[PDB]
């Protein structure tokens, strides 16, 4: 899939709860985890659009009350070819 | 993809707005643009069921206020095997 | 294309949305995404002045309500050669 899911949270703990909930709740692949600085982490997933929507909806529910919390949960169904340069391809 | 997304619009200028929005919003393929006659132009897009639901919504909003406007917006998640023979396969 | 457009946002979920919107809206090239620190992410996009005015406006409208939101959205139609040394050539 080409769809992107992104859950940003304050801290890596909410991010890992959300990361696990997204990949266990839909056929999405964790493409990366980026530390944005300032106590923000982003967990990016990629899959078909319905899968990504279910994954991001499930992750946002899991981390809302885990730790500092959830800043954002966003779905971009097709990302421009240029945005694909600033997006992680695989984690670590 | 198996799903069909059709944005019928009065005029071609609203149809090219609808086409630009759909193909940009989600991973769909403009499979045809048909001059139905009488000022009707239908843009048909084939993609995954989630991708065609996100493209049709985007296209309908975009083309609404461009030109004469939107006649119809429709999603057929799968089309009977027989309706596949009246459907366009690539745009002209 | 020598104009510079630049949307700072709090987070990479607000910034990636902005990059997608900016790149989709006009013929602009995403030249970098920088983790400024403190939870700020600047997505800089080069291109002709008209395209960078379209793209930055699209990015601002898009990321305004995603995540923490938009810190700033600025256009520089020509950038002194000196300031070109502190600007990203391509995304890393």
């Amino acid at each position: 899939g080409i769809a992107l899911g992104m859950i940003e949270t304050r801290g890596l703990v909410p991010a890992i709860e959300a990361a696990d909930a997204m990949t266990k709740a839909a056929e999405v692949r964790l493409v990366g985890r980026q530390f944005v600085g300032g106590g923000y982490v982003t967990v990016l997933v990629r899959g078909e659009t319905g899968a990504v929507n279910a994954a991001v909806r499930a992750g946002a529910d899991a981390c809302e009350r885990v730790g500092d919390g959830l800043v954002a949960a966003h779905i971009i169904a097709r990302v421009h070819s240029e945005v694909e340069n600033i997006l992680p391809k695989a984690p670590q | 993809g198996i799903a069909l997304g059709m944005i019928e619009t009065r005029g071609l200028v609203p149809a090219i707005e609808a086409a630009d929005a759909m193909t940009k919003a989600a991973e769909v393929r403009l499979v045809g643009r048909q001059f139905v006659g009488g000022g009707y132009v239908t843009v048909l897009v084939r993609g995954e069921t989630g991708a065609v639901n996100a493209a049709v919504r985007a296209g309908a909003d975009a083309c609404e206020r461009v030109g004469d406007g939107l006649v119809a917006a429709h999603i057929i998640a799968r089309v009977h095997s027989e309706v596949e023979n009246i459907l366009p396969k690539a745009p002209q | 294309g020598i104009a510079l457009g630049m949307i700072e946002t709090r987070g990479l979920v607000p910034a990636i949305e902005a990059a997608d919107a900016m790149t989709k809206a006009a013929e602009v090239r995403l030249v970098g995404r920088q983790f400024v620190g403190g939870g700020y992410v600047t997505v800089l996009v080069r291109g002709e002045t008209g395209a960078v005015n379209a793209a930055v406006r699209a990015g601002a409208d898009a990321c305004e309500r995603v995540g923490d939101g938009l810190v700033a959205a600025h256009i520089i139609a020509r950038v002194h050669s000196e300031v070109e040394n502190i600007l990203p050539k391509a995304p890393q």
């Binding site: 929507n53 909806r57 499930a58 946002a60 | 639901n53 996100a54 | -």
Partner: peptide
């Protein structure tokens, strides 16, 4: 209603609105 993973996080998710 239709229960599932789409039911979750109704007001939090942003981006790519799907068909009404």
């Amino acid at each position: 209603r239709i229960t599932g993973p789409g039911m979750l996080a109704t007001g939090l998710i942003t981006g790519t609105p799907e068909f009404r």
